[PDB]
Amino acid sequence: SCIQIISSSQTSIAGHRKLCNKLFTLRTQGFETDILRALNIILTVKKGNSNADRVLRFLVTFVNYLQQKDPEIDIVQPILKHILRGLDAKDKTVRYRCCQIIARVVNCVKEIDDDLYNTLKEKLLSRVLDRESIVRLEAVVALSRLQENDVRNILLFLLQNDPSSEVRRSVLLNIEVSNSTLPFILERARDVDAANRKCVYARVLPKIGDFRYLSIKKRVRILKWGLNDRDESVEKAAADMLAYQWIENADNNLLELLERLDVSNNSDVAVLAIKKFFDVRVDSLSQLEFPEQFWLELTAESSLLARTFNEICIEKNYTDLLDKMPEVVQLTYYIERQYVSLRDKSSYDESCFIIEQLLYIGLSQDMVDEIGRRKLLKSLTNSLSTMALPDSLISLHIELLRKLCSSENDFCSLLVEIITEVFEQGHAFNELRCLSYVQCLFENITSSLNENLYMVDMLKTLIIPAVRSHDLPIREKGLECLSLVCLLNADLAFENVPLYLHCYEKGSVVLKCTAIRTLTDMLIQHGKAKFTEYEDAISSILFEALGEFENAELQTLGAEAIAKLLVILHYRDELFLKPLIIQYFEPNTVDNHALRQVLGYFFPVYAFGAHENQWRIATIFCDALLSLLEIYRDDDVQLSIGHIAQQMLDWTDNEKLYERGDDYIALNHNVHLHLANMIFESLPNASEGKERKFMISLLGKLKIPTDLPSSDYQRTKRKLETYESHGFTMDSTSLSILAKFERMLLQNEEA
Amino acid sequence: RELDNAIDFLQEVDVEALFTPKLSHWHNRCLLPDDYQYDSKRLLQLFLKPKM
């Protein structure tokens, strides 16, 4: 009857309206009782049942249908009183169904009796800490119906620390949105689960009416994460929020939106946002117009838009769209108008940004227009000779100059003439500007052919005098200039290695960083064999740098230098691979996130690039891991080591090679079976206890293929036996791992 | 559907029995590694001549 109506809603949802009417004929009765009887049978069904949700969907549907009309019958209060008793239960599903039901039923109306309010709150607050994840999920949904502090603070706590992604998402989807709760939902934009990240852009942020409510630094941090996200869906959700919601708050005026991003201080994010907006809204790209008026009233946002539009069309090859960008003749004119604005300080910072954008547009052009090429060259030749551009624009000016010159020789000739004229004027600020021109000169040439005389000149006239100057800024700038000249001549590089070694030991941190970059670049540029006389001295400073956890910048630099020397040159990999792994996992360096970022990228690239790189890691694996054990004993010690070891094991797994001619892969020895041999030979030097126990634990995690030659399995068993002959005392699990490993070897020989 | 779930709502149930009356692992607080900052292009660039 009344219960069988419910049992009939089991199959489908279409008839729910029909059954609501018939059941609405039996209101005046064992009404209440029969429903609770139906729910008592919903507590027995385990999760995963399409029905239980259908039945429960039918009930929430009928309740609402009942409040409209004949609200005389208050059935939400009895049903909640009956089911709250089960919040404390041992069948996790009785708890999960109870929370499931309460969450949906309470949502059917707001007016509740206070005693029903308090009791439900007290019991639910304990539930959201349930041992099962499914209970927590439905509990926060139920609890979130009694929001408004203590209520709220608990949701922030699970959202932030709950180990289950589905739970976090449920909290993320029902928590209140306010400046107090805002910082934590934005953190989820970097959640490990893609769906949780996508939820922040797709559902949670739209709840905020306007993006202006956020601080400018919040707006930028959002787009930086969203538009660069690794997952195609999260990245799409962030681009849609930017291209359909945020553009709306800015009156559908892209410029007005750009003005709310402080583009001059957030250039990289602002460019990406523009590009992503037009990936979503390609129709708008063809609607931008750049009349003469546009270029005479340029702004920071207006100029960035043109530079990005030009950047897109070139990449996308939208040739007809590029016809809207000006010719170099007009561009040279637009730049020169902007120079005038540099005289007035109130418009100085913006004009530097505008000029920057125009130079980028100019660097993009392939100007067959000799006429306009000559004009822009004159303008640049003049601006560098007479004006006092900031260090920021100097580089782009000299870079664009190189692009216009017919060859490196004409570029050196011209730029030396400019440097000499600027040098005559001053005869501090003047000399530093000259050296900045010298620095950009040697940054834009690649070989020393045909420019010996220009070099010997810059050396005698500026660089050496600067290197010997007692004024600290000039000396530092002179050394950077000297370094770039060493990258053009190997013999000069070799002649100055002693100087840059003297810079590291007796110099400041700034000078140590100059030495690391210089010596590293001389090796990469000129080759490894040229400097073998200084091999130990250079490696020394690379070691010392990597161990200075006091200087995050210097430490990160040594780590980076080693990384590129290994990948590019294979520069004593064996010697550095172990100190690198130790420092990378060392606790004293954990706070240095810059270092963990470069090595976070290097190890996968190095390990997974070649079979020989995985072999080198297994060769020092044990010694690196043992060194970390000693370091770690001095919060949880055993748990972190396990994650470290599994990382090193993944690096050495042959299956994880990226892979890309090798006819003789035949007798390549398996790195993991080679690592087993390493472990057997190192167990004696381990200290009995967790250490020797832990090293044996790794034998069970190894990935040994079953198609290797028999002599390989035979060789490792010999290693196994040699270790067994020591007669060390081992616990049960150790002996079980060794026995299971020894039998695996036999089985793979047999096959 | 072919997959009968399937529920018999006339079965006998004992309410008191079902109603008969926290968890501390709870580190790496579910956030991606910092890896978007390092421009992978830096590795194969010279420190002093990035646009090489």
Numbering used by the authors:
A (entry chain A): 2 to 30, 32 to 150, 157 to 435, 491 to 697, 701 to 726, 731 to 821
B (entry chain C): 477 to 497, 503 to 504, 507 to 509, 512 to 537
What does the paper say about this structure?
A peptide loop of the kleisin subunit encircles the bound DNA and, like a safety belt, prevents its dissociation. Firm closure of the kleisin loop around DNA is essential for the association of condensin complexes with chromosomes and their DNA-stimulated ATPase activity.
This helix and the succeeding well-ordered turn stack onto HEAT motifs 16 and 17 and onto the α4 segment of the kleisin via several highly conserved aromatic residues in a manner that resembles a “latch” that has been inserted into a “buckle”. The absence of density for the latch segment in half of the complexes suggests that the α2 to α4 segments of the kleisin subunit are sufficient for complex formation with the HEAT-repeat subunit.
